[PDB]
Coordinates of C-alpha atoms in Angstrom, one line a residue:
Chain A
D84 CA -1.1 98.0 -12.9
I85 CA 1.3 100.2 -15.0
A86 CA -0.7 99.1 -18.0
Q87 CA -3.2 101.8 -16.9
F88 CA -0.5 104.1 -18.3
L89 CA 0.0 102.1 -21.5
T90 CA -3.7 102.3 -22.6
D91 CA -3.2 105.9 -21.7
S92 CA -0.3 106.0 -24.2
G93 CA -2.5 104.8 -27.0
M94 CA -2.2 101.0 -26.6
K95 CA -5.2 99.1 -27.6
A96 CA -5.7 95.3 -28.0
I97 CA -6.8 94.8 -31.6
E98 CA -9.8 92.7 -32.6
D99 CA -9.1 89.5 -34.6
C100 CA -10.6 90.7 -37.9
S101 CA -11.4 93.7 -40.0
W102 CA -13.9 94.4 -42.8
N103 CA -12.9 96.8 -45.6
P104 CA -15.5 98.0 -48.1
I105 CA -12.9 99.2 -50.6
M106 CA -11.7 95.6 -50.9
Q107 CA -14.9 94.2 -49.5
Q108 CA -13.0 91.3 -47.8
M109 CA -12.6 90.3 -44.2
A110 CA -9.0 90.4 -43.0
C111 CA -8.1 88.4 -40.0
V112 CA -5.0 87.9 -37.8
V113 CA -3.1 84.8 -38.9
Chain B
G38 CA -2.6 149.7 -44.5
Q39 CA -5.1 146.9 -44.1
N40 CA -3.7 143.4 -43.7
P41 CA -3.8 141.5 -47.0
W42 CA -3.4 138.1 -45.4
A43 CA -6.6 138.6 -43.5
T44 CA -8.2 140.5 -46.4
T45 CA -7.5 138.9 -49.7
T46 CA -8.7 135.5 -50.9
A47 CA -5.3 134.3 -52.2
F48 CA -3.4 135.5 -49.1
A49 CA -6.1 134.6 -46.6
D50 CA -6.5 131.1 -47.9
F51 CA -2.8 130.5 -47.4
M52 CA -2.4 132.2 -44.0
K53 CA -5.5 130.2 -42.8
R54 CA -3.3 127.0 -43.0
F55 CA -1.1 128.3 -40.3
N56 CA -3.7 128.3 -37.6
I57 CA -2.8 124.8 -36.5
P58 CA -5.3 124.7 -33.6
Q59 CA -8.1 125.5 -36.0
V60 CA -7.0 123.4 -39.0
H61 CA -5.5 120.5 -37.2
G62 CA -6.9 120.7 -33.7
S63 CA -4.8 118.1 -31.9
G64 CA -1.4 117.1 -30.7
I65 CA 1.2 117.0 -33.5
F66 CA 4.1 115.3 -31.8
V67 CA 1.8 112.8 -30.3
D68 CA -1.8 112.9 -31.7
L69 CA -4.2 111.4 -29.3
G70 CA -6.9 113.9 -29.8
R71 CA -10.0 111.8 -29.4
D72 CA -11.2 108.9 -27.2
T73 CA -13.4 106.0 -28.3
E74 CA -14.8 102.9 -26.6
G75 CA -12.6 103.7 -23.6
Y76 CA -9.4 104.1 -25.6
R77 CA -7.3 107.0 -27.0
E78 CA -7.5 107.7 -30.7
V79 CA -5.4 109.5 -33.2
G80 CA -7.8 112.3 -34.3
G81 CA -5.9 115.2 -36.0
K82 CA -7.3 116.8 -39.1
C83 CA -4.1 117.5 -41.0
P84 CA -1.6 114.9 -42.2
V85 CA 2.0 115.1 -40.8
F86 CA 5.0 115.1 -43.1
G87 CA 8.2 113.2 -42.2
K88 CA 6.8 111.8 -39.0
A89 CA 8.1 108.4 -38.1
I90 CA 8.5 106.2 -35.0
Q91 CA 12.0 105.6 -33.9
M92 CA 12.2 102.3 -31.9
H93 CA 14.7 100.9 -29.4
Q94 CA 14.5 97.2 -29.9
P95 CA 17.9 95.5 -29.7
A96 CA 20.2 95.5 -32.8
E97 CA 19.2 92.0 -33.9
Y98 CA 15.7 93.3 -34.2
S99 CA 14.9 95.1 -37.5
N100 CA 13.7 98.1 -35.6
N101 CA 11.3 99.3 -38.3
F102 CA 7.8 100.5 -37.1
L103 CA 6.3 99.7 -40.5
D104 CA 7.0 96.0 -39.9
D105 CA 4.0 93.7 -39.3
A106 CA 3.0 94.3 -35.7
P107 CA 3.7 91.4 -33.3
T108 CA 1.3 88.7 -34.3
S109 CA 0.9 86.3 -31.2
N110 CA 2.1 87.8 -27.9
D111 CA 5.3 85.9 -27.6
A112 CA 6.7 84.5 -24.3
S113 CA 10.4 84.0 -25.3
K114 CA 10.1 87.5 -26.8
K115 CA 11.0 90.4 -24.6
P116 CA 10.8 92.8 -26.1
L117 CA 8.2 91.9 -28.5
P118 CA 9.4 92.0 -32.1
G119 CA 7.9 93.7 -35.1
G120 CA 6.5 97.2 -35.8
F121 CA 3.2 98.9 -36.0
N122 CA 1.7 97.8 -39.3
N123 CA -1.6 95.9 -39.1
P124 CA -0.8 92.2 -39.7
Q125 CA -4.2 90.9 -40.7
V126 CA -4.8 89.0 -44.0
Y127 CA -7.7 89.1 -46.4
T128 CA -9.6 85.9 -47.5
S129 CA -7.8 86.4 -50.8
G130 CA -4.6 85.6 -48.9
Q131 CA -3.6 89.3 -49.5
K132 CA -2.2 91.3 -46.6
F133 CA -4.5 93.9 -45.2
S134 CA -1.6 96.4 -45.0
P135 CA 0.2 97.8 -46.7
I136 CA -1.6 98.2 -49.9
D137 CA -0.5 99.8 -53.2
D138 CA -1.8 103.2 -54.1
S139 CA -2.4 101.7 -57.5
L140 CA -4.6 99.0 -56.0
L141 CA -6.6 101.8 -54.3
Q142 CA -7.4 103.9 -57.3
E143 CA -8.6 101.0 -59.5
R144 CA -11.0 99.8 -56.7
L145 CA -11.9 103.3 -55.5
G146 CA -12.3 104.7 -59.0
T147 CA -13.6 108.1 -60.1
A148 CA -15.9 108.7 -57.1
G149 CA -12.9 108.3 -54.8
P150 CA -10.4 110.9 -53.6
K151 CA -7.9 112.5 -55.9
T152 CA -4.9 112.7 -53.5
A153 CA -3.2 109.4 -52.7
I154 CA -3.0 110.6 -49.0
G155 CA -6.8 111.1 -49.2
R156 CA -7.0 107.7 -50.7
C157 CA -5.0 106.1 -47.9
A158 CA -6.6 107.9 -45.1
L159 CA -9.9 106.6 -46.5
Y160 CA -8.6 103.1 -46.5
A161 CA -8.0 103.5 -42.8
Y162 CA -11.3 105.2 -42.2
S163 CA -13.2 102.6 -44.3
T164 CA -11.9 99.8 -42.0
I165 CA -14.2 98.3 -39.4
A166 CA -12.8 96.1 -36.7
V167 CA -14.9 93.0 -36.2
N168 CA -15.2 90.0 -33.8
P169 CA -15.9 86.7 -35.7
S170 CA -17.3 85.4 -32.5
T171 CA -20.2 87.4 -31.0
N172 CA -20.3 89.4 -34.2
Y173 CA -19.2 92.8 -32.9
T174 CA -18.0 95.9 -34.6
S175 CA -16.0 98.9 -33.4
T176 CA -16.1 102.6 -34.5
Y177 CA -12.4 102.8 -33.4
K178 CA -10.2 104.0 -36.3
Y179 CA -6.4 103.6 -36.6
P180 CA -3.8 106.0 -38.1
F181 CA -2.4 105.4 -41.5
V182 CA 1.1 106.1 -42.6
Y183 CA 1.6 106.8 -46.4
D184 CA 5.0 106.2 -48.0
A185 CA 5.3 108.8 -50.8
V186 CA 8.4 107.2 -52.3
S187 CA 7.0 103.8 -53.1
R188 CA 3.4 104.8 -53.1
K189 CA 2.2 102.4 -50.4
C190 CA -0.6 103.0 -48.0
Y191 CA 0.0 101.4 -44.5
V192 CA -2.7 101.1 -41.9
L193 CA -1.2 100.8 -38.4
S194 CA -2.7 98.9 -35.5
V195 CA -0.7 100.9 -33.1
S196 CA -2.1 104.3 -32.2
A197 CA 0.7 104.7 -29.7
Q198 CA 3.3 107.2 -30.7
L199 CA 5.6 107.6 -27.6
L200 CA 6.7 105.1 -24.9
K201 CA 9.3 106.3 -22.4
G202 CA 10.7 105.0 -19.2
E203 CA 12.0 101.8 -17.7
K204 CA 8.9 101.1 -15.7
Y205 CA 7.2 100.7 -19.1
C206 CA 9.7 100.0 -21.9
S207 CA 13.1 98.6 -22.8
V208 CA 15.7 100.8 -24.5
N209 CA 18.1 98.7 -26.6
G210 CA 17.3 95.4 -24.8
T211 CA 17.5 97.1 -21.3
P212 CA 16.0 96.4 -18.8
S213 CA 15.5 93.1 -20.4
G214 CA 12.4 91.4 -19.1
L215 CA 10.0 94.0 -20.4
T216 CA 7.5 93.2 -23.2
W217 CA 7.5 96.7 -24.9
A218 CA 10.5 98.4 -26.5
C219 CA 10.7 102.2 -26.2
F220 CA 9.6 104.4 -29.1
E221 CA 9.3 108.1 -29.9
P222 CA 8.3 110.2 -33.0
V223 CA 10.8 111.9 -35.2
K224 CA 10.8 113.9 -38.4
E225 CA 13.0 112.0 -40.8
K226 CA 14.2 112.9 -44.3
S227 CA 15.6 109.8 -45.9
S228 CA 15.6 109.5 -49.7
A229 CA 14.6 105.8 -49.5
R230 CA 11.2 106.3 -47.7
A231 CA 9.1 109.4 -47.5
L232 CA 6.5 109.1 -44.8
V233 CA 3.3 110.9 -43.9
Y234 CA 1.6 110.0 -40.7
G235 CA -2.1 110.9 -40.2
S236 CA -5.3 110.3 -38.3
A237 CA -8.0 108.4 -40.1
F238 CA -10.1 111.5 -39.6
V239 CA -8.4 113.2 -42.5
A240 CA -10.7 111.1 -44.5
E241 CA -13.9 112.1 -42.6
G242 CA -15.9 114.5 -44.8
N243 CA -13.8 115.3 -47.9
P244 CA -10.5 113.3 -47.9
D245 CA -8.7 115.7 -50.3
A246 CA -9.4 118.7 -48.1
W247 CA -5.9 118.8 -46.4
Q248 CA -4.3 119.8 -49.7
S249 CA -6.1 123.1 -49.7
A250 CA -6.5 123.4 -46.0
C251 CA -3.3 122.4 -44.1
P252 CA 0.2 123.8 -43.6
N253 CA 1.6 121.0 -45.8
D254 CA 4.8 122.6 -46.9
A255 CA 7.7 124.7 -45.7
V256 CA 7.7 128.2 -47.0
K257 CA 10.8 129.7 -48.7
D258 CA 11.9 133.3 -48.4
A259 CA 9.5 134.3 -45.6
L260 CA 9.0 134.6 -41.9
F261 CA 6.0 134.1 -39.7
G262 CA 4.7 137.3 -38.2
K263 CA 2.0 139.3 -36.6
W264 CA 0.7 142.4 -38.5
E265 CA 1.5 145.7 -36.7
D266 CA 1.3 149.4 -37.8
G267 CA 0.4 148.6 -41.4
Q268 CA 3.2 146.1 -41.9
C269 CA 4.1 142.5 -41.1
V270 CA 6.6 142.2 -38.1
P271 CA 8.5 138.9 -37.9
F272 CA 8.1 137.2 -34.6
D273 CA 11.4 138.2 -32.9
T274 CA 13.6 135.8 -30.9
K275 CA 12.6 137.7 -27.8
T276 CA 9.0 136.3 -27.6
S277 CA 10.1 132.9 -28.9
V278 CA 10.0 129.8 -26.8
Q279 CA 13.6 129.0 -28.0
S280 CA 15.8 130.5 -30.6
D281 CA 19.0 128.5 -30.5
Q282 CA 21.5 128.7 -33.4
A283 CA 21.0 125.9 -35.9
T284 CA 23.4 124.5 -38.3
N285 CA 21.1 124.3 -41.3
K286 CA 17.6 124.7 -42.6
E287 CA 16.6 121.0 -42.5
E288 CA 17.9 120.9 -38.9
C289 CA 15.4 123.6 -37.9
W290 CA 12.6 121.6 -39.5
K291 CA 13.3 118.6 -37.2
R292 CA 13.8 120.7 -34.2
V293 CA 10.3 122.1 -34.3
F294 CA 8.7 118.8 -34.5
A295 CA 10.5 117.5 -31.4
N296 CA 11.0 120.6 -29.2
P297 CA 9.7 120.2 -25.6
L298 CA 6.7 122.6 -26.0
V299 CA 5.2 121.4 -29.3
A300 CA 1.5 120.5 -29.2
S301 CA 1.4 116.9 -27.9
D302 CA -1.2 114.6 -26.3
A303 CA 1.2 112.2 -24.5
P304 CA 0.4 111.5 -20.8
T305 CA 2.4 113.4 -18.1
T306 CA 3.3 112.3 -14.6
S307 CA -4.3 111.4 -17.6
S308 CA -5.4 111.8 -21.3
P309 CA -4.1 115.4 -22.1
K310 CA -5.5 117.1 -25.1
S311 CA -3.5 119.9 -26.6
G312 CA -6.1 120.9 -29.2
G313 CA -3.0 121.8 -31.4
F314 CA -1.8 124.5 -29.0
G315 CA 2.0 124.7 -28.6
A316 CA 5.3 125.8 -30.0
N317 CA 4.5 124.6 -33.5
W318 CA 5.8 127.4 -35.8
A319 CA 9.4 128.3 -36.4
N320 CA 11.4 130.9 -38.3
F321 CA 14.7 130.0 -39.8
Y322 CA 16.9 133.0 -40.7
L323 CA 20.3 134.6 -40.7
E324 CA 20.9 137.1 -37.9
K325 CA 22.3 140.4 -39.2
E326 CA 24.0 140.5 -35.8
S327 CA 26.9 138.1 -35.6
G328 CA 25.8 136.0 -38.6
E329 CA 24.8 132.8 -36.9
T330 CA 21.7 131.1 -38.3
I331 CA 18.9 130.9 -35.9
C332 CA 15.9 128.5 -35.5
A333 CA 13.1 130.5 -33.8
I334 CA 10.3 128.3 -32.3
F335 CA 7.1 130.3 -31.5
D336 CA 3.7 129.5 -30.0
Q337 CA 2.0 132.5 -31.4
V338 CA -0.4 131.9 -34.4
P339 CA 1.0 133.9 -37.2
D340 CA -1.4 136.1 -39.2
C341 CA 0.9 137.3 -41.9
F342 CA 4.2 136.6 -43.7
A343 CA 7.2 139.0 -43.8
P344 CA 8.9 138.1 -47.2
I345 CA 12.8 137.9 -47.0
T346 CA 15.4 136.6 -49.3
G347 CA 16.9 133.2 -48.2
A348 CA 14.5 132.6 -45.2
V349 CA 12.3 129.7 -44.3
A350 CA 9.3 129.4 -42.1
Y351 CA 8.5 125.8 -40.9
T352 CA 5.8 124.2 -38.9
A353 CA 5.8 121.0 -36.8
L354 CA 3.1 119.6 -39.2
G355 CA 4.6 120.3 -42.5
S356 CA 7.0 119.0 -45.1
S357 CA 10.6 120.0 -45.3
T358 CA 10.2 121.1 -48.9
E359 CA 10.2 124.8 -49.4
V360 CA 7.5 126.6 -51.5
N361 CA 6.8 130.2 -52.6
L362 CA 4.4 132.7 -51.2
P363 CA 1.5 133.9 -53.2
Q364 CA 2.7 137.0 -55.1
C365 CA -0.8 138.2 -56.1
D366 CA -4.6 137.5 -56.1
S367 CA -5.8 136.5 -59.5
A368 CA -9.3 137.7 -58.8
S369 CA -8.3 141.2 -57.5
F370 CA -5.0 141.9 -59.3
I371 CA -5.1 144.4 -62.2
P372 CA -2.5 143.5 -64.9
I373 CA 0.2 146.2 -65.0
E374 CA 1.8 147.2 -68.2
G375 CA 5.3 148.5 -68.0
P376 CA 6.5 151.6 -70.0
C377 CA 6.5 150.9 -73.7
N378 CA 10.2 151.1 -74.7
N379 CA 11.5 149.7 -78.1
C380 CA 7.7 149.3 -78.9
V381 CA 7.8 146.4 -76.5
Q382 CA 6.7 146.3 -72.9
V383 CA 6.7 143.6 -70.2
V384 CA 3.2 142.9 -69.1
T385 CA 2.5 141.4 -65.6
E386 CA -0.4 139.1 -64.7
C387 CA -1.7 136.8 -62.0
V388 CA -2.1 133.3 -63.3
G389 CA -2.4 131.1 -60.2
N390 CA -1.3 133.7 -57.6
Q391 CA 2.1 134.3 -59.1
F392 CA 3.5 137.0 -61.4
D393 CA 3.9 135.9 -64.9
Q394 CA 5.6 138.6 -66.8
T395 CA 5.1 138.2 -70.5
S396 CA 6.6 140.9 -72.8
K397 CA 4.3 142.4 -75.4
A398 CA 4.7 145.0 -78.2
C399 CA 2.5 148.1 -77.8
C400 CA 3.3 149.1 -81.4

């Protein structure tokens, strides 16, 4: 689709969680 | 008549910051310099001062890009409400972003970066995206924005910086139907928030390097130039991309960021990569000819500074705050003692690349 162009504009579907070693916790989408 | 900006450590170190392609190496207006896992990634080495995302969600919407990004892709929502800030939560029940700069230092400690920008870039860089299912990780990194007023570090989850055109986005509710609202970057100088947008790759290697390394500030009383016939010749409005009159100094600053030839990686019509090349430098000055102030955008990498009272040389990366040229090189500069009159003489030195005149008594 057009969404060829949206990825090509920097759009990226995030992953549910993150890990951060500075806080050493897992952060997830609520 | 050798060039001191190339030659001398104090002057060279400064002038080096103004090779944007070399020190930044990516689009400024839109920074999509890298690609990872089949996506485009904010990559630029220098942080960008005053950059913000203007949005065009309808008035009812808060229209702030630092708002929690839209959490669950909503059906009754078109366009999708929120902003760009990562909306994830820690187990602690604490929001992933934004975080205080206080919180950072305490947890980071002595080993961590000195600058708060360094600190926030590293937050972003430190972050690994994970799938709880199918335990999977990504090397993909997201751009941070740092609010200098309040001292908060935001990590975004939206690497996009520009969205334009009614096939793809809605301006101000129109055409209603469409999920995404239009947005574009803009240099903004509010007193209420003071934003700095950067790649997470500012943090790669030494996170405090930008400070010494990048064209962070505007320069007062100077004009970008090439060095010709033993002297520094200001780029003239004749080789400039555009040199329109400009009401004030801060107006020139915003114009360079946004002008239609500034280094930018946004897709034309396709992942274009500017490598930092573009109309990124500008001179602000009062024409001796009919005295209308001019903003003079250039694409030529300056290699010296012509000093001039009341002038300002700005770049698309840098702050709006003016700052002095180096007046001398500590290492090389021999202190000069003025004539001894009244048994007192002024004596001139080079503490931190500036002239400190302190008056002494010869007798």
